[PDB]
From Swiss-Prot, chain A:
This is Trafficking protein particle complex subunit 20. It holds the Pfam family Sedlin_N. One of its GO terms (biological process) is endoplasmic reticulum to Golgi vesicle-mediated transport. The gene is TRS20. Its main location: Golgi. InterPro entries: Longin-like_dom_sf, Sedlin. Present with 1200 molecules/cell in log phase SD medium. GO terms for cellular component: cytoplasm; cytosol; endoplasmic reticulum; nucleus; phagophore assembly site; TRAPP complex; TRAPPI protein complex; TRAPPII protein complex. Component of the TRAPP I, TRAPP II and TRAPP III complexes which act as guanine nucleotide exchange factors (GEF) for YPT1. TRAPP I plays a key role in the late stages of endoplasmic reticulum to Golgi traffic. TRAPP II plays a role in intra-Golgi transport. TRAPP III plays a role in autophagosome formation.
Swiss-Prot record, chain B:
Present with 259 molecules/cell in log phase SD medium. This is Trafficking protein particle complex II-specific subunit 120. Part of the multisubunit TRAPP (transport protein particle) II complex composed of BET3, BET5, TRS20, TRS23, TRS31, TRS33, TRS65, TRS120 and TRS130. Interacts directly with TRS65. Signal peptide: none annotated. Belongs to the TRS120 family. It is found in: Golgi apparatus, cis-Golgi network. Specific subunit of the TRAPP II complex, a highly conserved vesicle tethering complex that functions in the late Golgi as a guanine nucleotide exchanger (GEF) for the Golgi YPT1 GTPase. TRS120 plays a role in the YPT GEF activity of TRAPP II in concert with the two other TRAPP II-specific subunits TRS65 and TRS130. The modification Phosphoserine is found at S66, S74. It comes from Saccharomyces cerevisiae (strain ATCC 204508 / S288c).
From Swiss-Prot, chain C:
The lineage of its organism: Eukaryota, Fungi, Dikarya, Ascomycota, Saccharomycotina. Present with 8350 molecules/cell in log phase SD medium. Part of the multisubunit TRAPP (transport protein particle) I complex composed of BET3, BET5, TRS20, TRS23, TRS31 and TRS33. Part of the multisubunit TRAPP (transport protein particle) II complex composed of BET3, BET5, TRS20, TRS23, TRS31, TRS33, TRS65, TRS85, TRS120 and TRS130. Part of the multisubunit TRAPP (transport protein particle) III complex composed of BET3, BET5, TRS20, TRS23, TRS31, TRS33 and TRS85. The gene is TRS31. One of its GO terms (biological process) is macroautophagy. The keyword Endoplasmic reticulum applies. Its main location: Golgi. Keywords: Autophagy, Endoplasmic reticulum, ER-Golgi transport, Golgi apparatus, Transport. InterPro entries: NO_sig/Golgi_transp_ligand-bd, TRAPP-I_su5, TRAPP_component. This is Trafficking protein particle complex subunit 31. SUPFAM superfamilies: Ligand-binding domain in the NO signalling and Golgi transport. Transmembrane segments: none annotated. It is found in: Golgi apparatus, cis-Golgi network; Endoplasmic reticulum; Preautophagosomal structure.
Length: 147, 248, 202
């Protein structure tokens, strides 16, 4: 299963989704209720620590697998305003983001384009969630076609 | 066999040095006993215990896994305790790794970076010892695993490791490396006695607090909460829980 | 009904391709206007903010909020279209040193709002934690007569919300130094806070 979230400035969430394969339809079995937001909020901090490092632990936008915990790796992207696109990947065996590392860099850039496109509405303040029906189709067609 | 007499000496040597290593109390100040395994030396109880542990670890490394890793950890603890006293055991303690660099690989002369290499090799030797039966003694022949005693080695490894990071602009150990070297134990953690599991989460919270990681703290106190709730016995009120709920 | 904060919606991948509802575009398409049509709306900012304000200082710091809500939009746009959706766009350098974002604001923000690059960028040599940015001609305040510079601050709030959303908490203040034959020279001093100041040291 895959968990994806856009974490704001004060760490308040603005987009919150999971998407998973049809083999296990009820995804993340007894982690989605009780560990899956805690590992996200706990491992915001190493992403925050990596925002002021010139070289990691000459792009500084994509970040690799930044944490690995029970065999779940997370990947991160620090945008220009500071909204961080952290996403947890889950599998059966040891999951590899290295098979998609060339791929899903153009998933983070193609959701950052959607965040910039929903920033320019002047009625949209900061620190309020994205209550957009267009945004769901615009992220899940990108998740279906490019994983 | 020669391996049978070497196994007898391997059983003998580490325990024969361990009580003399445990014969130190407030650096052995004016405790003149009957002089049978209690020397009451002035400032050489650590030196005599270090020589005993050096001979014992040399004999166990000549008899080369579990007791070997305990012997290498005993030699590391004897070198660290002898260096903890401000004494002349510096060149002798650095050259006392004659079998420790033969079985392990220390290869350093710094402030416990040699002990960092010896501790990493000790955890590697205990990890090699994990490829065996789960419990090798008599009363530990049907025990939990080796997973209840690897964990006591690496938590005191972290407890000795993170104190090198004093906050200032020199960092003796980069800030990420013990954050890496505490996440290696994702053992199942399913069953053991509970008062180990309070203590491991409490000191893992304290090492995250002294590093300055204010959300991994919330993660490990949430693990402490979940471990406290699901215990099958009954517990009582204590004012530790008051300030625990206050800090969370 | 997509993200409520009551729950995280659990939805399976590889569904059907749904209908397409609203599609926009993001490149520049450099479309011009007349400066009279800008200055009329700028004086209609000020002709209401004079009306609903009691003293000078709260008029200053709520003319600044309008610039704040252009700066926090413009920071995400300008780097993203300078580093260049379905155009396989890459990333820049996401700059993180105080005289590497001052070069960016000095050479690109002023070349975006205005046609020219701003002329000079002056460190305060006799102290630290003041950083002057100047021009020679403020083209929005150029129809205001007199000398009082409260009507400046809509541009300086564009500066401040550029940095406050960039992770650099600062505070700007505009002044007027009529040097030479440029009678409207109009320095801004960016003045970073103390709690940022240790972090670029380490």
């Amino acid at each position: 299963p895959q968990y994806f979230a856009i974490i704001g400035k004060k760490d308040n969430p603005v987009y919150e989704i999971e998407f998973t394969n049809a083999e296990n339809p009820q995804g993340f079995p007894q982690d989605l209720k009780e560990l899956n937001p805690f590992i996200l909020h706990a491992s915001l901090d190493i992403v925050e620590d990596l925002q002021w490092q010139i070289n990691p632990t000459t792009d500084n936008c994509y970040l690799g697998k930044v944490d690995h915990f029970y065999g779940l790796a997370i990947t991160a992207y620090i945008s220009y305003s500071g909204m961080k696109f952290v996403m947890i990947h889950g599998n059966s065996a040891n999951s590899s983001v290295v098979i998609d590392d060339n791929n899903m860099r153009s998933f983070y850039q193609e959701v950052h384009e959607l965040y910039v496109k929903t920033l320019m509405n002047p009625f949209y303040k900061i620190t309020d969630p994205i209550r957009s029906p267009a945004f769901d189709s615009r992220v899940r067609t990108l998740a279906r076609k490019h994983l | 066999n020669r391996s049978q007499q070497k196994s007898l000496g391997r059983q003998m040597k580490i325990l024969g040095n361990f009580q003399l290593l445990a014969g130190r109390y407030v650096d052995a100040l004016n405790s003149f006993v009957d002089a049978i395994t209690t020397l009451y030396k002035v400032r050489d109880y650590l030196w005599l215990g270090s020589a005993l542990d050096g001979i014992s670890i040399c004999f166990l490394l000549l008899s080369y896994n579990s007791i070997s890793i305990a012997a290498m950890q005993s030699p590391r603890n004897s070198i660290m305790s002898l260096s903890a006293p401000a004494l002349n055991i510096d060149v002798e303690n650095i050259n006392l790794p004659l079998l420790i660099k033969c079985i392990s690989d220390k290869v350093l002369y710094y402030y416990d970076l040699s002990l960092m290499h010896n501790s990493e090799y000790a955890p590697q030797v205990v990890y090699c010892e994990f490829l065996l039966k789960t419990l090798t003694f008599m009363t530990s022949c049907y025990k939990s695993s080796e997973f209840s005693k690897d964990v006591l080695d690496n938590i005191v490894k972290n407890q000795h490791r993170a104190l090198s990071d004093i906050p200032n602009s020199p960092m003796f150990p980069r800030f990420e490396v013990y954050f890496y070297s505490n996440k290696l134990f994702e053992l199942q953690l399913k069953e053991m006695q509970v008062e180990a599991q309070i203590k491991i989460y409490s000191t893992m919270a304290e090492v995250y607090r002294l590093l300055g990681y204010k959300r991994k703290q919330l993660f490990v106190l949430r693990l402490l909460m979940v471990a406290l709730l699901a215990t099958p016995n009954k517990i009582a009120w204590h004012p530790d829980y008051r300030t625990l709920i206050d800090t969370i | 009904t997509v993200g409520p904060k009551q729950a995280i919606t659990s939805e399976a991948s590889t569904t059907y391709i749904p209908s397409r509802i609203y599609s926009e575009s993001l490149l520049f398409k450099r479309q011009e206007a007349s400066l009279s049509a800008m200055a009329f709306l700028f004086q209609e900012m000020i002709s209401q903010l004079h009306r609903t304000c009691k003293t000078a200082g709260d008029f200053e710091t709520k003319l600044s909020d309008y610039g704040h809500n252009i700066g926090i939009r413009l920071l995400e746009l300008l780097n993203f279209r300078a580093s260049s959706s379905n155009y396989i766009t890459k990333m820049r350098r996401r700059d993180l040193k105080i005289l590497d974002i001052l070069q960016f604001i000095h050479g690109t923000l002023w070349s975006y709002l205005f046609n020219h690059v701003s002329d000079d960028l002056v460190k305060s040599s006799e102290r630290d934690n003041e950083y002057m940015i100047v021009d020679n001609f403020p083209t929005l305040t150029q129809f205001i007569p007199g000398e009082n510079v409260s009507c400046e601050y809509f541009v300086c709030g564009i500066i401040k919300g550029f940095l406050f959303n960039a992770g650099f908490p600062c505070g700007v203040t505009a002044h007027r130094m009529p040097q030479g034959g440029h009678s409207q020279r109009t320095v801004y001093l960016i003045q970073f806070d103390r709690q940022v100041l240790d972090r670029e040291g380490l």
